[PDB]
């Protein structure tokens, strides 16, 4: 479930001296709002989507060499230039070797030689500069009824409305924060994890890179960082790559800042500070008859991780949509004790199970739910 | 070809005041020995094989995780221990999550959870301590005839003999050197290249390692260096590797000392200082008649990279195995000028081509090869 049973959930209650109550919404946390005559709402931040990030530079971390050619000459015959020297998709190397009889040349001496190989990247990571203003926050408002409404907000339109399903409307004004010095900070993505590193530290990485505005994927820059030519023997210099740089990147990003994922969705850390105005909220119910008084416990008392207690029951009896007779009594039945979180428990159908939550006082307490013809008298010992 | 036309070739001549001449044999270099009445020999170091190296430790650089299991519990139900915790081939992780209704548990609160995954290494490098005394050096001695004898030496048996094919025998005494502080130095092998690194720097590498005496390949030590558990959500913590560490190793070994290969054979740098005693060497020939005097130039004059000049000719004429009339004359035919490198050029067969090498003086010189009935009078301009 949500909110109830979430270790990171804060309660808040609007005073009777006005409205405009402040809440703090963060990812993985729920906020519970309530007041007298006002319905209880649950606010939760779902995802923080940073749409339209600007690709800054693309580095290659795993490449492969194919189409390796080699051409040699004899002493006093000129250098052996290859056509692949005029191709940015290739990397070449010149050298000189000893030439004479046993290798089939004119005379003795230093003969030139050239070896080229096609550079083709296989796996490559990316880096993007992210804009702070065009961020998007998804918030879910749920009426705490026990039987959600989404809203997208952005720093360029912090004011919004919320047409709840039969509960009225509530006004929101949020102000955000999500990091540190975003303009000169780059989100690095390895197509498996994500980090937030410095701009200068990212721009000067010793790897074959391509500019942001690029779709070629073959005219890289500084390919020699992943390509080394071995010592030439008879002819071919035996060019060789340097394997994969995935582990080097995973190890070099230790002192960075990683961002988890929810299968695609980036979990951006940060908190929204929001003002809520609930003066235009109505309670779904009120004008309802009382139920006949038969209730069967689907499952009885169970305290949450925030002092509040919850019971799930079913109406079963017939009496239309009606209000649940619910009272919190002493060890006897003197006065009413704890308050109610799920304000005005209603019933949509006799077969639909309904949960209810409330905060009891210390020690022994009674819960009277249902009229006498089938009254549920559930005792418990809080704390 | 060899020796002739090798840019790293040194000449040496034994004086008439005894024998025991010193030479320096290194990989990729040839030594030319000669003297009056003594045949010319070519010494070359082929391979430096360090047989029987002692494996010290085996590190893994590319692993993969399979057989991932996960088990959870409810609050006040105990921790969920898995059977894979008692298996060194697995890596596990404990955690606690929020549990209540929507995830099917008893009540609310912190419920334990455990996730394990089988650690299986795919590609792994090795490190070996190498012994200096049990080194093996392969030397090739070739009689400079123009138409080789191998010997294996070790520091534990530096004295040897050389039964040349019809030239007598020569005595050798070599003393070696090949590096720096071998006892606390480890040869690192990645099954593609080889380095020589420090012992302490190698023993403390942050990678899953196994002791030297090991054939298991699955009960590694410190596997968590290549395994990280992501944040748990509903149940599985989503364990993930760190890719491949091949690039990290290839980059970290920059300030080391690399060793090239000749397809399997390690090219150990170093020089052997050898004493040669050639007093028991005879010249294959001497008691031979002179040829009739017909020679056709297979290919004429061509100077090497060490001042010496070479011509390849064929006998063609009939006259049994005979000695070649060969003289170096002035611009006229006054006196004999340059000496001869291929001492006493013989002939095995009239159809077998034969090379000849000699050093001429400055400027113009004549080469008289063959008796007058078909005499070859080849002029050239050295320097
Ligand atoms: C590389 O070699 C393959 C196989 O011969 C060939 O199909 C391909 O066209 C070559 N590419 C280049 C750029 O030469
Ligand atoms: C891992 O899973 C495969 C596929 O189910 C199975 O064949 C293998 O026996 C499993 N290994 C272990 C150690 O559980």
Numbering used by the authors:
A (entry chain A), B (entry chain A): 1 to 147, 159 to 394
Q: Please, what does the article write about this entry?
A:
The DENV lipid envelope contains 180 copies of the envelope glycoprotein (E), which covers the surface of the virus particle. On the mature infectious virus particle, E is arranged in a herringbone pattern as antiparallel homodimers that pack laterally into a lipid raft containing three dimers. The E protein monomer contains three predominantly β sheet domains (DI, DII, and DIII) connected to a transmembrane domain by an amphipathic helix. As DENV enters the cell, the E protein undergoes a pH-induced conformational change from a dimeric to a trimeric form that triggers fusion of viral and endosomal membranes required for releasing the viral genome into the cytoplasm of the cell.
To compare SC.10 and WT sE structures and to validate the accuracy of the Rosetta design models, we determined the crystal structure of SC.10 at 3.42 Å using molecular replacement (MR). Despite growing the crystal at pH 4.4, SC.10 retained the prefusion DENV2 sE dimer conformation. In addition to the structural rigidity that prolines can provide, the new hydrogen bond may be helping to stabilize the sE dimer. As predicted by the Rosetta model, the two mutations in IntFc2, T262R and A259W, lead to canonical pi-cation interactions across the central dimer interface between R262 on one chain and W259 on the other chain. T280P is at the base of the kl loop, and in the SC.10 structure, the backbone at residue 280 is shifted to create a new backbone side chain hydrogen bond between the P280 backbone carbonyl and the T189 side chain hydroxyl in an adjacent loop.
